[PDB]
Design a protein around this nucleic acid. Sequence first.
RNA 1: CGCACGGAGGCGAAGAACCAUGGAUUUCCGAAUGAGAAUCUCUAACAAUUGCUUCGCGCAAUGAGGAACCCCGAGAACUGAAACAUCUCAGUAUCGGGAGGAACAGAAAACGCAAUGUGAUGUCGUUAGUAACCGCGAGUGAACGCGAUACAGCCCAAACCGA
Lengths: 46, 119, 65, 81, 194
Amino acid sequence: GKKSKATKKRLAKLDNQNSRVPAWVMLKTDRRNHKRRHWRRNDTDE
Amino acid sequence: PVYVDFDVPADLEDDALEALEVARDTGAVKKGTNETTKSIERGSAELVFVAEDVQPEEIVMHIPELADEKGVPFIFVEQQDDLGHAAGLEVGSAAAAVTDAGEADADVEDIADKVEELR
Amino acid sequence: TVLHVQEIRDMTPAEREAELDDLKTELLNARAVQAAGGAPENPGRIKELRKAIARIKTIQGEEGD
Amino acid sequence: SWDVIKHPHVTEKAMNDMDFQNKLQFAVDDRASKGEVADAVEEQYDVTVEQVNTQNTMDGEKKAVVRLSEDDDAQEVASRI
Amino acid sequence: ARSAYSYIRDAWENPGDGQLAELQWQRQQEWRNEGAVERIERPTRLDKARSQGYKAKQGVIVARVSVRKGSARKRRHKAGRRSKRQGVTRITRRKDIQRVAEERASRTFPNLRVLNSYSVGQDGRQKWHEVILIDPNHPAIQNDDDLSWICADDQADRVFRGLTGAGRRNRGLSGKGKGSEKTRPSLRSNGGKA
RNA sequence: CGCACGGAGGCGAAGAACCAUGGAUUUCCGAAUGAGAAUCUCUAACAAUUGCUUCGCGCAAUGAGGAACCCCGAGAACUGAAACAUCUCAGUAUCGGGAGGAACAGAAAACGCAAUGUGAUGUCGUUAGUAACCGCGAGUGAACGCGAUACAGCCCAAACCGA
Ligand SMILES: [Cl-]
Ligand SMILES: [Cl-]
Ligand SMILES: [K+]
Ligand SMILES: [Mg+2]
Ligand SMILES: [Mg+2]
Ligand SMILES: [Mg+2]
Ligand SMILES: [Mg+2]
Ligand SMILES: [Mg+2]
Ligand SMILES: [Mg+2]
Ligand SMILES: [Mg+2]
Ligand SMILES: [Mg+2]
Ligand code: NA
Ligand code: NA
Ligand code: NA
Ligand code: NA
Ligand code: NA
Ligand code: NA
Ligand code: NA
Ligand code: NA
Ligand code: NA
Ligand code: NA
């Protein structure tokens, strides 16, 4: 398939949202990324 | 056109409008269909003018038959704004009535006599 | 912090423009060091660089350039 | 208003183009054209730009590969800031 | 003495007799060839217009509107219905043709507001009315002690809410006593029973 | 130096943080209005419909949103009647259009305790499950008056004037 410039910006964001909760946040809050998505198991929009 | 039953020659109309102008300066004239109407009704009208390019026609239909049952003489005019300019207005008038002429009582009588012949 | 409001208003409609492009350049060179994962960072400075530009721009608007 | 040049793209591939091909890589604004990228580079570094190549990366940004002339030296420029 | 206006009125008591009869025969021919909403420079019935609110002034508009004659243009039921609700032919709408014309006119002039309207006749298959509209934004009207009220916010879209003259009558608000128990102060408040 | 108790560093007596009011900034799509498009692109733009008019988009208007309330139109059936068609559920559900901070109504071609009487309109209590409707079945169902709340009355068309 052919992705447009806008479509590309969105996939790009979703990929970034896929990162983990940084180690330093666990300490600052004295102790989970509920939006962890998988390319195969999950399904993005569009 | 429905209320018009005879055509008045351009030359006659010219005479009529000329006399009306000197009538506004010497004698007295009524400008407007309403004022023209009460003139015929009260009798003070000597010669009444009626434009031909009136739309709606209802504004003037009543004049012809009214003038007939009051002995008042009447004449037609091609354009509404010519009658208004003659009566001395920045706008036109659907009808005008000479309420007692002046310096033209002679001409008025002639035009009146001329029209009766024109039917 | 190192740049105060009074000091900005004391500038002329040209000095602020020069000072603007100056700050913008310091910022760019900071983000250049950051882009290369540079360690001589001063988190408070780069932060202040952004606010200063905002202040100068804010004053420019008030003063009519 | 948006600024054309965001920051220098410093990766191993970006260093090869620099040492071997006299090219400087930049992360720029995705509204900027090749022509607007060249101009900004010359005004921010005082060098002569020959060719620019762009890519709309999967990071929401635009990557520009600016090639300097033989008159200038890429390694010397990037090493100053 | 009788006003010149009283003559326009009298002719219209009998639109089928006299000169008005011949006039109407002629006019309608051009009317049938016109649109649904035609802005016109001068009202066909001066006396009625002025009586309703009309004024030869800036911001005062008039438009002739034709609507089809007859009952409702209803579609037959497509699902289950008891005999009482299977009708098509004898069903008529609760809004009258004059109020329909008023609406189609107000939509053509989205900035103006309906003042009133009157009938100018009909042929074998359509009816014509002339609506009087007013520009609430023109300062000539905003300083008119007779028409300024139609500038207030609560007068916005007045026709679509039945605040027009023909509107209030169709809503059965004429009578103040007997027979008006379910109509005043509103149809909706009385559970829709008129 | 947010939630958020880390690390590094920074800011504050040039009175910061924090709060109140006013202002600056305010990307793209969106009524979305130059034209097209799954938030982007292509070469100046109130697009469209209107009013006024210097007849030039020159001055203006409309559009869409809002928890319900409000007003004007369109209008079911399950159900009840121990079946069912009128009736009932109900002018309800739902649909189209529109206004406001509230809407609508409103200064008698009224009432009709018939009077030598009342005196704009809403609303609350009552009148009253009374009058009236109805396969006179099941069911349906007011008002005048009264006690209260709050109170406020006015402008045109025309006559006679005629710029
Ligand atoms: Cl309206
Ligand atoms: Cl009483
Ligand atoms: K039923
Ligand atoms: Mg990754
Ligand atoms: Mg390419
Ligand atoms: Mg109410
Ligand atoms: Mg567009
Ligand atoms: Mg049953
Ligand atoms: Mg019922
Ligand atoms: Mg039975
Ligand atoms: Mg009663
Ligand atoms: Na997938
Ligand atoms: Na980046
Ligand atoms: Na309108
Ligand atoms: Na009824
Ligand atoms: Na803002
Ligand atoms: Na506009
Ligand atoms: Na224009
Ligand atoms: Na049953
Ligand atoms: Na059954
Ligand atoms: Na029945």
